[PDB]
Amino acid sequence: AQNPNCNIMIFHPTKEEFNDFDKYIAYMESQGAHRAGLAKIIPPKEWKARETYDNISEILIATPLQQVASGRAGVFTQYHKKKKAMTVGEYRHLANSKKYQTPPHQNFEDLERKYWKNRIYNSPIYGADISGSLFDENTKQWNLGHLGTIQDLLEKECGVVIEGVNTPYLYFGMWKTTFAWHTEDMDLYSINYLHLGEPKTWYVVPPEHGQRLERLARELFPGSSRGCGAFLRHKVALISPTVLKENGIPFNRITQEAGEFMVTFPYGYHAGFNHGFNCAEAINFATPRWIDYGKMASQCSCGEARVTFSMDAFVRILQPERYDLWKRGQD
Ligand SMILES: O=C(O)CNC(=O)C(=O)O
Ligand SMILES: [Mg+2]
Ligand code: NI
Ligand SMILES: [Zn+2]
């Protein structure tokens, strides 16, 4: 068995190997990359996502989200308070202000210490989930706006044509902006490209150990657990590496820098934080190996998780028993 310790693997494809996306994902899996739940892909030196980032300031962040924490430093939830619209140029200036900017630090480990010590005492503003792309249309390789769609994969594997679309999302971050512990919708893959700015630190639980994280979360967030049998789908709970280590939960960590891709694998729980002003692009995708994970994915039916239009068909075809209850949660 390849990668039996479930370490995060880092790949350096050549420009020739960067042509065929599906083939390279299957290669990384042949080497055991999925066992970690997360892999890093450093693009060939010849590749670029676009020519420059000099002209992005007029993108609108219609609904910036202020991430307000409750709890203790290592075990907290966050809720998202909606703020007034602002442009990316306005948000960059805000991220660089004395109130929000990255503090002085020695190295990524010192910054990680400061994040976990101090996160809860601040409320950073995240420009999340903005439909769009920063890949140039002429970028042919690993262009997250030109991937094969999940609907087409389901149709190829299973023979059933379904409605729905699959487009990328932009994320504009600042120091301390936080992504809570989750797997993807329908336990899909995700791919994330850090276009510019400061790093993103990731934490990940191997898929084979995801239920260990779920059991800890039910213990640590006991009210939320009674409210919903899949409350991590709400994407609000944070647990620190120290608390994970105290409780014996297997996990790994890695820092993504600008110019690098990350892939999350089916049922790989992940969480993390931004170091400073940055912009990332991400999308879900599927492969043949996902289908079995989609069939078994948990679902929130309490009404909190509320998701995209395209998840309807995935539930309806892969999980027909659950469909009725899940759709009640959506309406
Ligand atoms: O970058 C972020 O805020 C969160 N991204 C992801 O969870 C992802 O790409 O799967
Ligand atoms: Mg612009
Ligand atoms: Ni994710
Ligand atoms: Zn729920």
PDB file of C-alpha atoms and ligand atoms in Angstrom, residues 126 128 171 178-180 182 184 189-193 200 202 235 256 262 264 270-272 274 280-284, ligand 1:
ATOM      1  CA  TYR A 126     -13.239  37.231   4.473  1.00  0.00           C
ATOM      2  CA  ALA A 128     -15.560  34.207   0.228  1.00  0.00           C
ATOM      3  CA  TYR A 171     -11.676  33.855  -2.052  1.00  0.00           C
ATOM      4  CA  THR A 178     -10.453  30.968   8.808  1.00  0.00           C
ATOM      5  CA  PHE A 179     -11.917  27.950   7.069  1.00  0.00           C
ATOM      6  CA  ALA A 180     -13.675  25.627   9.496  1.00  0.00           C
ATOM      7  CA  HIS A 182     -15.246  20.261   6.707  1.00  0.00           C
ATOM      8  CA  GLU A 184     -16.617  18.988   0.464  1.00  0.00           C
ATOM      9  CA  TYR A 189     -12.594  16.551  -4.389  1.00  0.00           C
ATOM     10  CA  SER A 190     -11.579  20.197  -4.334  1.00  0.00           C
ATOM     11  CA  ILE A 191      -8.726  21.979  -6.065  1.00  0.00           C
ATOM     12  CA  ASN A 192      -7.476  25.331  -4.798  1.00  0.00           C
ATOM     13  CA  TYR A 193      -4.989  27.673  -6.495  1.00  0.00           C
ATOM     14  CA  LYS A 200      -2.650  29.687   3.568  1.00  0.00           C
ATOM     15  CA  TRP A 202      -3.966  23.827   5.989  1.00  0.00           C
ATOM     16  CA  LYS A 235     -18.742  24.821   8.351  1.00  0.00           C
ATOM     17  CA  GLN A 256       0.457  26.704   0.633  1.00  0.00           C
ATOM     18  CA  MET A 262      -3.745  22.082  -3.328  1.00  0.00           C
ATOM     19  CA  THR A 264      -8.379  17.808  -1.290  1.00  0.00           C
ATOM     20  CA  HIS A 270      -9.654  20.084   6.273  1.00  0.00           C
ATOM     21  CA  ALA A 271      -9.422  23.483   8.021  1.00  0.00           C
ATOM     22  CA  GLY A 272      -6.989  26.373   7.957  1.00  0.00           C
ATOM     23  CA  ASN A 274      -4.741  32.835   5.847  1.00  0.00           C
ATOM     24  CA  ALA A 280      -7.417  31.917  -3.983  1.00  0.00           C
ATOM     25  CA  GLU A 281      -9.611  30.172  -6.563  1.00  0.00           C
ATOM     26  CA  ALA A 282     -11.217  26.807  -5.915  1.00  0.00           C
ATOM     27  CA  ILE A 283     -13.685  24.382  -7.468  1.00  0.00           C
ATOM     28  CA  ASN A 284     -15.059  20.919  -6.753  1.00  0.00           C
TER      29      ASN A 284
HETATM   30  O1  LIG B   1      -9.475  28.640   0.913  1.00  0.00           O
HETATM   31  C1  LIG B   1     -10.512  28.518   1.667  1.00  0.00           C
HETATM   32  O2  LIG B   1     -11.038  29.416   2.433  1.00  0.00           O
HETATM   33  C2  LIG B   1     -11.265  27.258   1.798  1.00  0.00           C
HETATM   34  N1  LIG B   1     -10.976  26.342   0.666  1.00  0.00           N
HETATM   35  C3  LIG B   1     -11.313  25.074   0.716  1.00  0.00           C
HETATM   36  O3  LIG B   1     -11.930  24.475   1.703  1.00  0.00           O
HETATM   37  C4  LIG B   1     -11.029  24.223  -0.481  1.00  0.00           C
HETATM   38  O4  LIG B   1     -10.372  24.631  -1.453  1.00  0.00           O
HETATM   39  O5  LIG B   1     -11.553  23.077  -0.400  1.00  0.00           O
END
